[PDB]
Paper text:
We determined the high-resolution crystal structures of two variants of the class 3 MchDnaB1 intein (MchDnaB1_HN and MchDnaB1_HAA). We found that the most striking feature of the crystal structures of the MchDnaB1 intein is the active site, closely resembling the catalytic triad of serine/cysteine proteases. The WCT motif found in the class 3 intein participates in forming the catalytic triad, in which Cys124, His65, and Thr143 could serve as nucleophilic, basic, and acidic functional groups, respectively. Importantly, we could observe clear electron density near the side-chains of Cys124, His65, and the backbone of Val125 for both crystal structures of the MchDnaDB1_HN and MchDnaB1_HAA inteins (modeled as oxyanion waters in Figure 2a and Supplemental Figure S2). However, the crystal structures of both MchDnaB1 intein variants (HN and HAA at the C-terminus) lacked electron densities for the N-extein sequences. This observation is presumably due to self-cleavage at the N-terminus during sample preparation and/or crystallization (N-cleavage). We observed electron density for both the gauche+ and trans-like conformations of Cys124 in the crystal structure of MchDnaB1_HN, although the side-chain conformation of Cys124 in the trans-like conformation is less evident in the second molecule (chain B) in the asymmetric unit. Upon removal of the N-extein in the simulation, the population largely shifted towards the ideal gauche+ conformation with χ1 = ~300° (−60°), with more frequent rotation between gauche+ and trans-like conformations. This observation might suggest that both crystal structures represent the post-splicing or post-cleavage status as expected from the primary structure of the variants.
Protein splicing is catalyzed by intervening protein sequences termed inteins. The protein-splicing reaction involves the self-removal of the intein and concomitant joining of the two flanking sequences (exteins). All splicing domains found among inteins have the same structural architecture named HINT (Hedgehog/INTein) which relates to the C-terminal domain of the Hedgehog protein (Hh–C or hog domain). Instead of the N-terminal serine or cysteine missing among class 3 inteins, class 3 inteins contain an additional nucleophilic cysteine residue in block F.
Numbering used by the authors: 1 to 90, 105 to 145
The structure:
Protein backbone atom coordinates (compact mmCIF):
# COMPACT_ATOMS: atom_id res chain seq x y z
CA UNK A 1 0.00 0.00 0.00
CA UNK A 2 1.09 3.59 -0.73
CA UNK A 3 0.39 6.79 1.20
CA UNK A 4 -2.83 8.55 0.16
CA UNK A 5 -0.87 11.62 -0.91
CA UNK A 6 1.24 9.66 -3.41
CA UNK A 7 0.74 11.17 -6.88
CA UNK A 8 0.06 8.55 -9.52
CA UNK A 9 0.42 9.31 -13.24
CA UNK A 10 -2.48 8.57 -15.56
CA UNK A 11 -2.72 8.69 -19.37
CA UNK A 12 -4.26 12.18 -19.08
CA UNK A 13 -2.75 13.67 -15.94
CA UNK A 14 -2.19 12.90 -12.27
CA UNK A 15 -4.28 11.45 -9.48
CA UNK A 16 -3.50 10.58 -5.87
CA UNK A 17 -3.66 7.18 -4.23
CA UNK A 18 -6.37 8.67 -2.02
CA UNK A 19 -8.43 9.88 -5.01
CA UNK A 20 -8.02 6.93 -7.39
CA UNK A 21 -11.20 4.95 -8.03
CA UNK A 22 -11.82 1.44 -9.27
CA UNK A 23 -12.08 1.73 -13.04
CA UNK A 24 -9.54 4.58 -13.32
CA UNK A 25 -6.62 4.24 -15.72
CA UNK A 26 -3.12 4.18 -14.24
CA UNK A 27 0.08 3.36 -16.19
CA UNK A 28 1.74 -0.02 -16.50
CA UNK A 29 5.47 -0.58 -16.58
CA UNK A 30 5.17 -0.47 -20.38
CA UNK A 31 3.87 3.10 -20.12
CA UNK A 32 0.44 2.06 -21.47
CA UNK A 33 -2.88 2.41 -19.63
CA UNK A 34 -3.81 -0.23 -17.08
CA UNK A 35 -7.16 -0.31 -15.29
CA UNK A 36 -7.60 -0.32 -11.52
CA UNK A 37 -9.73 -3.43 -11.07
CA UNK A 38 -9.88 -3.41 -7.25
CA UNK A 39 -8.82 -1.22 -4.36
CA UNK A 40 -8.74 -1.45 -0.58
CA UNK A 41 -10.27 0.90 1.89
CA UNK A 42 -7.94 3.35 3.56
CA UNK A 43 -5.72 1.40 5.98
CA UNK A 44 -4.52 3.07 9.19
CA UNK A 45 -1.72 2.30 11.61
CA UNK A 46 0.41 0.27 9.19
CA UNK A 47 4.20 0.47 9.65
CA UNK A 48 5.48 2.75 6.88
CA UNK A 49 8.75 3.37 5.04
CA UNK A 50 9.92 6.43 3.14
CA UNK A 51 11.69 5.49 -0.10
CA UNK A 52 13.78 8.13 -1.89
CA UNK A 53 14.87 7.51 -5.49
CA UNK A 54 17.83 8.80 -7.49
CA UNK A 55 15.58 11.14 -9.52
CA UNK A 56 14.26 12.94 -6.43
CA UNK A 57 10.99 10.98 -6.26
CA UNK A 58 9.95 10.19 -2.67
CA UNK A 59 7.25 7.60 -1.98
CA UNK A 60 5.86 6.57 1.40
CA UNK A 61 4.69 2.97 1.39
CA UNK A 62 3.83 0.39 3.95
CA UNK A 63 6.59 -1.95 5.10
CA UNK A 64 5.24 -4.90 3.08
CA UNK A 65 4.71 -3.03 -0.20
CA UNK A 66 6.65 -4.75 -2.97
CA UNK A 67 9.04 -3.30 -5.57
CA UNK A 68 10.64 -4.74 -8.75
CA UNK A 69 14.40 -4.61 -8.20
CA UNK A 70 17.58 -5.81 -9.88
CA UNK A 71 17.72 -8.71 -7.41
CA UNK A 72 14.05 -9.66 -7.49
CA UNK A 73 11.00 -8.58 -5.53
CA UNK A 74 11.70 -6.56 -2.40
CA UNK A 75 9.43 -5.14 0.25
CA UNK A 76 9.89 -1.51 1.28
CA UNK A 77 11.51 -2.67 4.53
CA UNK A 78 14.12 -4.71 2.66
CA UNK A 79 15.22 -2.07 0.13
CA UNK A 80 18.91 -1.13 0.41
CA UNK A 81 19.96 2.51 0.08
CA UNK A 82 22.55 3.04 -2.65
CA UNK A 83 22.27 -0.52 -3.95
CA UNK A 84 18.82 -1.55 -5.14
CA UNK A 85 17.66 -0.41 -8.57
CA UNK A 86 14.08 -0.47 -9.83
CA UNK A 87 14.05 -2.60 -12.99
CA UNK A 88 11.31 -4.20 -15.07
CA UNK A 89 12.06 -7.28 -17.16
CA UNK A 90 11.41 -7.07 -20.90
CA UNK A 91 17.68 -4.54 -18.44
CA UNK A 92 17.66 -0.74 -18.06
CA UNK A 93 17.20 0.50 -14.49
CA UNK A 94 14.51 3.12 -14.01
CA UNK A 95 16.01 4.64 -10.83
CA UNK A 96 18.27 3.71 -7.93
CA UNK A 97 17.13 3.60 -4.31
CA UNK A 98 18.84 6.52 -2.58
CA UNK A 99 17.32 5.95 0.87
CA UNK A 100 14.75 3.66 2.46
CA UNK A 101 13.84 4.20 6.10
CA UNK A 102 11.12 3.62 8.67
CA UNK A 103 8.81 6.62 9.26
CA UNK A 104 5.72 7.39 11.31
CA UNK A 105 2.58 5.62 10.10
CA UNK A 106 0.38 7.44 7.59
CA UNK A 107 -2.87 6.32 5.95
CA UNK A 108 -2.18 4.01 3.00
CA UNK A 109 -4.18 2.23 0.32
CA UNK A 110 -3.67 -0.60 -2.14
CA UNK A 111 -4.83 -0.94 -5.71
CA UNK A 112 -4.83 -3.91 -8.07
CA UNK A 113 -4.32 -3.28 -11.79
CA UNK A 114 -4.94 -5.52 -14.80
CA UNK A 115 -1.31 -5.28 -15.98
CA UNK A 116 -0.07 -8.90 -16.37
CA UNK A 117 3.28 -7.86 -14.85
CA UNK A 118 1.38 -6.68 -11.72
CA UNK A 119 3.04 -3.25 -12.08
CA UNK A 120 1.86 0.35 -12.11
CA UNK A 121 3.77 3.63 -12.03
CA UNK A 122 3.93 5.80 -8.91
CA UNK A 123 5.35 9.10 -7.75
CA UNK A 124 6.36 12.17 -9.70
CA UNK A 125 9.11 10.11 -11.35
CA UNK A 126 6.66 7.41 -12.50
CA UNK A 127 8.51 4.60 -10.72
CA UNK A 128 7.26 1.03 -11.32
CA UNK A 129 5.85 -0.68 -8.24
CA UNK A 130 3.90 -3.86 -7.48
CA UNK A 131 0.19 -3.94 -6.79
Amino acid sequence: ALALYTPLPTPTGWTTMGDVAVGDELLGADGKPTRVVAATDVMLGRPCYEVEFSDGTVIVADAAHQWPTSGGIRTSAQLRSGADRIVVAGLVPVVQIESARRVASVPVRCVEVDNPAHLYLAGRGMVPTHN
